[PDB]
Write a protein that binds this ligand. Structure first.
Ligand SMILES: NC(=O)c1ccc[n+]([C@@H]2O[C@H](COP(=O)([O-])OP(=O)(O)OC[C@H]3O[C@@H](n4cnc5c(N)ncnc54)[C@H](OP(=O)(O)O)[C@@H]3O)[C@@H](O)[C@H]2O)c1
Ligand SMILES: Nc1nc(=O)c2nc(CNc3ccc(C(=O)N[C@@H](CCC(=O)O)C(=O)O)cc3)cnc2[nH]1
Ligand SMILES: [Mn+2]
Ligand SMILES: [Mn+2]
Ligand SMILES: [Mn+2]
Ligand SMILES: [Mn+2]
Ligand SMILES: [Mn+2]
Ligand SMILES: [Mn+2]
Length: 159
């Protein structure tokens, strides 16, 4: 099965100038917890945004142009990206906006962090149909000394 994982600010903003304009260590630890020992698929812009391979995961990068780094797997289409994962229980799609748009219809599960931050942005999470999805887990956290915004961890499963 295919799952999406993302962190969204107000108005579904997920990025600005190829960067993440917030710092929530709690949310990054949640990202690691739910992606470790799984394959992760990302587009080339998100790969450049991270700037380095993610340890303990099979990194698969979508790009129409040849790869430039043998520490990861490069693929040229959604179907190849999926096939390159092999037979695993859960494929994690980690963005970005363009990549989210193409994998949303295939996905059975959404790992969404809702961040109470107002952010100008140039990239958005897709406007998914709420009727299609059932919320099966939610966990709200107030801001603290490490996390300057309040946030809500949510898991949605396609009905
Ligand atoms: N908050 C979050 O959860 C989160 C998560 C991830 C990223 N982000 C943010 O999202 C932004 C980047 O998003 P983005 O939409 O601009 O880029 P993206 O989706 O990360 O990458 C797009 C690139 O991926 C390749 N690609 C996508 N689909 C393909 C296909 N079917 N076949 C071949 N190649 C394909 C293309 O590479 P080529 O141009 O090489 O063909 C395309 O230019 C940044 O601001 C990042 O910080 C946020
Ligand atoms: N919920 C969520 N939050 C995010 O910040 C996020 N980010 C991306 C893409 N960008 C990034 C940027 C940095 C790291 C990163 O450095 N991760 C380390 C941090 C571990 C930690 O700090 O505990 C990792 O090993 O996963 C991952 C993804 C995709 N999905 C997300 N999903
Ligand atoms: Mn507004
Ligand atoms: Mn080689
Ligand atoms: Mn197979
Ligand atoms: Mn805030
Ligand atoms: Mn759309
Ligand atoms: Mn509804």
């Amino acid at each position: 099965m295919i799952s999406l994982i993302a962190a969204l600010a107000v108005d579904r903003v997920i990025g600005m100038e190829n960067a993440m304009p917030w710092n929530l260590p709690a949310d990054l630890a949640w990202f690691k917890r739910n992606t470790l020992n799984k394959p992760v698929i990302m587009g080339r812009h998100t790969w450049e945004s991270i700037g380095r391979p993610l340890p303990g995961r099979k990194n698969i990068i979508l790009s129409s142009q040849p790869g430039t780094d043998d520490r990861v797997t490069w693929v040229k289409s959604v179907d190849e990206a999926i096939a390159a994962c092999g037979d695993v229980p859960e494929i994690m799609v980690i963005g970005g906006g363009r990549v989210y748009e193409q994998f949303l219809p295939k996905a059975q599960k959404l790992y969404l962090t809702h961040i109470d931050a107002e952010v100008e942005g140039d990239t958005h999470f897709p406007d998914y149909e709420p009727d299609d999805w059932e919320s099966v887990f939610s966990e709200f956290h107030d801001a603290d000394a490490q996390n300057s915004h309040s946030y809500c961890f949510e898991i949605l499963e396609r009905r």
